[PDB]
Write an enzyme that holds these catalytic residues in place. Structure first.
Site, PDB file in Angstrom:
ATOM      1  N   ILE A  19       8.021  -6.066  15.391  1.00  0.00           N
ATOM      2  CA  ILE A  19       8.067  -4.586  15.402  1.00  0.00           C
ATOM      3  C   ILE A  19       6.781  -3.900  14.873  1.00  0.00           C
ATOM      4  O   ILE A  19       6.386  -2.858  15.409  1.00  0.00           O
ATOM      5  CB  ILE A  19       9.354  -4.039  14.712  1.00  0.00           C
ATOM      6  CG1 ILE A  19       9.482  -4.517  13.268  1.00  0.00           C
ATOM      7  CG2 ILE A  19      10.593  -4.474  15.489  1.00  0.00           C
ATOM      8  CD1 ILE A  19      10.811  -4.169  12.613  1.00  0.00           C
ATOM      9  N   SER A  21       2.433  -4.468  13.510  1.00  0.00           N
ATOM     10  CA  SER A  21       1.214  -5.195  13.924  1.00  0.00           C
ATOM     11  C   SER A  21      -0.053  -4.733  13.160  1.00  0.00           C
ATOM     12  O   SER A  21       0.046  -4.026  12.150  1.00  0.00           O
ATOM     13  CB  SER A  21       1.019  -5.042  15.443  1.00  0.00           C
ATOM     14  OG  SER A  21       0.265  -6.119  15.970  1.00  0.00           O
ATOM     15  N   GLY A  22      -1.222  -5.126  13.630  1.00  0.00           N
ATOM     16  CA  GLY A  22      -2.434  -4.669  12.992  1.00  0.00           C
ATOM     17  C   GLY A  22      -3.002  -5.479  11.852  1.00  0.00           C
ATOM     18  O   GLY A  22      -3.500  -6.580  12.055  1.00  0.00           O
ATOM     19  N   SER A  25      -1.170  -8.350   9.312  1.00  0.00           N
ATOM     20  CA  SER A  25       0.223  -8.308   8.945  1.00  0.00           C
ATOM     21  C   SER A  25       1.081  -8.131  10.162  1.00  0.00           C
ATOM     22  O   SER A  25       0.653  -7.566  11.145  1.00  0.00           O
ATOM     23  CB  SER A  25       0.464  -7.136   8.019  1.00  0.00           C
ATOM     24  OG  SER A  25       0.414  -5.929   8.743  1.00  0.00           O
ATOM     25  N   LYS A  26       2.305  -8.605  10.088  1.00  0.00           N
ATOM     26  CA  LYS A  26       3.246  -8.337  11.131  1.00  0.00           C
ATOM     27  C   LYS A  26       4.584  -8.129  10.505  1.00  0.00           C
ATOM     28  O   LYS A  26       4.910  -8.743   9.524  1.00  0.00           O
ATOM     29  CB  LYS A  26       3.317  -9.517  12.079  1.00  0.00           C
ATOM     30  CG  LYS A  26       1.980 -10.132  12.427  1.00  0.00           C
ATOM     31  CD  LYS A  26       2.138 -11.144  13.549  1.00  0.00           C
ATOM     32  CE  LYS A  26       1.543 -12.493  13.192  1.00  0.00           C
ATOM     33  NZ  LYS A  26       2.429 -13.632  13.551  1.00  0.00           N
ATOM     34  N   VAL A  27       5.382  -7.278  11.101  1.00  0.00           N
ATOM     35  CA  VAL A  27       6.782  -7.151  10.693  1.00  0.00           C
ATOM     36  C   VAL A  27       7.667  -7.718  11.808  1.00  0.00           C
ATOM     37  O   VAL A  27       7.342  -7.594  12.985  1.00  0.00           O
ATOM     38  CB  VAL A  27       7.132  -5.700  10.313  1.00  0.00           C
ATOM     39  CG1 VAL A  27       8.603  -5.561   9.938  1.00  0.00           C
ATOM     40  CG2 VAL A  27       6.264  -5.271   9.140  1.00  0.00           C
ATOM     41  N   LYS A  41       8.105  -8.721   6.538  1.00  0.00           N
ATOM     42  CA  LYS A  41       6.681  -8.446   6.595  1.00  0.00           C
ATOM     43  C   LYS A  41       5.925  -9.705   6.204  1.00  0.00           C
ATOM     44  O   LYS A  41       6.233 -10.327   5.196  1.00  0.00           O
ATOM     45  CB  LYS A  41       6.329  -7.298   5.662  1.00  0.00           C
ATOM     46  CG  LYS A  41       4.883  -6.830   5.723  1.00  0.00           C
ATOM     47  CD  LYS A  41       4.734  -5.634   4.801  1.00  0.00           C
ATOM     48  CE  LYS A  41       3.313  -5.086   4.713  1.00  0.00           C
ATOM     49  NZ  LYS A  41       3.156  -4.284   3.451  1.00  0.00           N
ATOM     50  N   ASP A 135      -0.839  10.179   0.624  1.00  0.00           N
ATOM     51  CA  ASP A 135      -0.787  10.123   2.085  1.00  0.00           C
ATOM     52  C   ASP A 135       0.665  10.022   2.609  1.00  0.00           C
ATOM     53  O   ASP A 135       0.998   9.106   3.360  1.00  0.00           O
ATOM     54  CB  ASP A 135      -1.623   8.900   2.513  1.00  0.00           C
ATOM     55  CG  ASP A 135      -1.795   8.766   4.026  1.00  0.00           C
ATOM     56  OD1 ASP A 135      -1.995   9.785   4.731  1.00  0.00           O
ATOM     57  OD2 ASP A 135      -1.746   7.607   4.499  1.00  0.00           O
TER      58      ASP A 135
HETATM   59  C1  LIG Z   1       4.578  -2.332   6.689  1.00  0.00           C
HETATM   60  C2  LIG Z   1       5.928  -2.281   5.976  1.00  0.00           C
HETATM   61  C3  LIG Z   1       7.099  -2.262   6.738  1.00  0.00           C
HETATM   62  C4  LIG Z   1       8.367  -2.220   6.132  1.00  0.00           C
HETATM   63  C5  LIG Z   1       9.552  -2.199   6.900  1.00  0.00           C
HETATM   64  C6  LIG Z   1      10.780  -2.644   6.374  1.00  0.00           C
HETATM   65  C7  LIG Z   1      11.954  -2.612   7.138  1.00  0.00           C
HETATM   66  C8  LIG Z   1      11.920  -2.147   8.453  1.00  0.00           C
HETATM   67  N1  LIG Z   1      12.839  -1.999   9.407  1.00  0.00           N
HETATM   68  C9  LIG Z   1      12.187  -1.493  10.461  1.00  0.00           C
HETATM   69  N2  LIG Z   1      12.772  -1.194  11.646  1.00  0.00           N
HETATM   70  C10 LIG Z   1      12.212  -0.432  12.615  1.00  0.00           C
HETATM   71  C11 LIG Z   1      12.490  -0.736  13.956  1.00  0.00           C
HETATM   72  C12 LIG Z   1      11.942   0.023  14.997  1.00  0.00           C
HETATM   73  C13 LIG Z   1      11.106   1.106  14.705  1.00  0.00           C
HETATM   74  C14 LIG Z   1      10.477   1.971  15.811  1.00  0.00           C
HETATM   75  O1  LIG Z   1      10.875   3.128  15.971  1.00  0.00           O
HETATM   76  N3  LIG Z   1       9.471   1.496  16.571  1.00  0.00           N
HETATM   77  C15 LIG Z   1       8.867   2.364  17.630  1.00  0.00           C
HETATM   78  C16 LIG Z   1       7.445   1.924  18.019  1.00  0.00           C
HETATM   79  O2  LIG Z   1       6.803   1.211  16.939  1.00  0.00           O
HETATM   80  C17 LIG Z   1       7.464  -0.051  16.700  1.00  0.00           C
HETATM   81  C18 LIG Z   1       8.962   0.101  16.383  1.00  0.00           C
HETATM   82  C19 LIG Z   1      10.826   1.419  13.375  1.00  0.00           C
HETATM   83  C20 LIG Z   1      11.377   0.665  12.339  1.00  0.00           C
HETATM   84  N4  LIG Z   1      10.893  -1.336  10.156  1.00  0.00           N
HETATM   85  N5  LIG Z   1      10.698  -1.702   8.995  1.00  0.00           N
HETATM   86  C21 LIG Z   1       9.528  -1.723   8.217  1.00  0.00           C
HETATM   87  C22 LIG Z   1       8.419  -2.190   4.727  1.00  0.00           C
HETATM   88  C23 LIG Z   1       7.248  -2.211   3.951  1.00  0.00           C
HETATM   89  C24 LIG Z   1       7.332  -2.187   2.421  1.00  0.00           C
HETATM   90  C25 LIG Z   1       5.999  -2.255   4.575  1.00  0.00           C
HETATM   91  O3  LIG Z   1       4.869  -2.277   3.816  1.00  0.00           O
END
Ligand SMILES: Cc1cc(-c2ccc3nc(Nc4ccc(C(=O)N5CCOCC5)cc4)nn3c2)cc(C)c1O
Length: 259
Positions: A19, A21-22, A25-27, A41, A135
């Site tokens: 989900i 990128s960049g 890191s990847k989630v 992550k 930010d």
């Molecule tokens: C970088 C980072 C990430 C997280 C983190 C933790 C849980 C989580 N659950 C989810 N679930 C989604 C699923 C889909 C979408 C969405 O609308 N998209 C549209 C186009 O872009 C790609 C996906 C957004 C969130 N995301 N997400 C992120 C936490 C922390 C602490 C970080 O540092």
């Protein structure tokens, strides 16, 4: 399909999809051994100086600490950190606020108030441990079972320059205060009430920066039905941080307090 896996702290997680990128890191959206859903992550460290390293460490320690203090900070269940990588297993989110705003038709007033409250609580919590994000923007929040959660703390480094407080643009915490986050929260609420941010229709991105800082450049506040909500926005979007409302003020404002 695949049987792709991540081991973190010995426990296996099947990947459903990527989900994020960049930046090294990847989630990943993920299934644990009890078929329960999570997000993971991952961060590769070969390419990371001591400053980016010390920041990542810092995000993790804060994510840790704050957990106890609020259910509006994204939950970190487990992590593994090594000289080469970091893996973090976190609660999973339906969608982020930024993508949600753009698709959501209008917006229920009792839903916006609740999202506002969520946001206030989260930022209030980080403020109480001396974090001043600086930010903020919708992407920093995640909807998890109709509840906004803070994911990022502005702590570890085209983006929308549409939530950016005046004082950030002056150097260009002796310049940035907690009041910086109020402005940004203010813009996020401004989106949710008038369908768009104060300077969304402003032209070249440099041309926005002039309006943000320009004190003679009025922001419009159309008469909406919720009188309290209208005041919140005016108090949040004051250019002087000295006159801008505080978070503890905002939690005692009638908007969040009377219904
Ligand atoms: C970088 C980072 C990430 C997280 C983190 C933790 C849980 C989580 N659950 C989810 N679930 C989604 C699923 C889909 C979408 C969405 O609308 N998209 C549209 C186009 O872009 C790609 C996906 C957004 C969130 N995301 N997400 C992120 C936490 C922390 C602490 C970080 O540092």
């Amino acid at each position: 399909g695949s049987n792709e896996c991540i081991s973190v702290k010995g426990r296996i997680y099947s990947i459903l999809k990527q989900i994020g990128s960049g930046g090294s890191s990847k989630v990943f959206q993920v299934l644990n051994e009890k078929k329960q859903i999570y997000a993971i992550k991952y961060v590769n460290l070969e390419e990371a100086d001591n400053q980016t390293l010390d920041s990542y460490r810092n995000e993790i320690a804060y994510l840790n600490k704050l957990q106890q203090h609020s259910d509006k900070i994204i939950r970190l269940y487990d992590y593994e950190i090594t000289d080469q990588y970091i893996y973090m297993v976190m609660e999973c989110g339906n969608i982020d606020l930024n993508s949600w705003l753009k698709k959501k038709k209008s917006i229920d007033p009792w839903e916006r108030k609740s999202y506002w409250k969520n946001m206030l609580e989260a930022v209030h919590t980080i403020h109480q441990h001396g974090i001043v994000h600086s930010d903020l923007k919708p992407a920093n929040f995640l909807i998890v079972d109709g509840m906004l959660k803070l994911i990022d703390f502005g702590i570890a480094n085209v983006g929308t320059v549409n939530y950016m407080p005046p004082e950030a643009i002056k150097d260009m915490k002796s310049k940035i205060s907690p009041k910086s986050d109020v402005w940004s929260l203010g813009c996020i609420l401004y989106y949710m009430t008038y369908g768009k941010t104060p300077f969304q229709q402003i032209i070249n991105q440099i041309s926005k920066l002039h309006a943000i800082i320009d004190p003679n450049h009025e922001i419009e506040f159309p008469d909406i039905p919720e009188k309290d909500l209208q005041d919140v926005l005016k108090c949040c979007l004051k250019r002087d941080p000295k006159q801008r409302i505080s978070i503890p003020e905002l939690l005692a404002h009638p908007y969040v307090q009377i219904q």
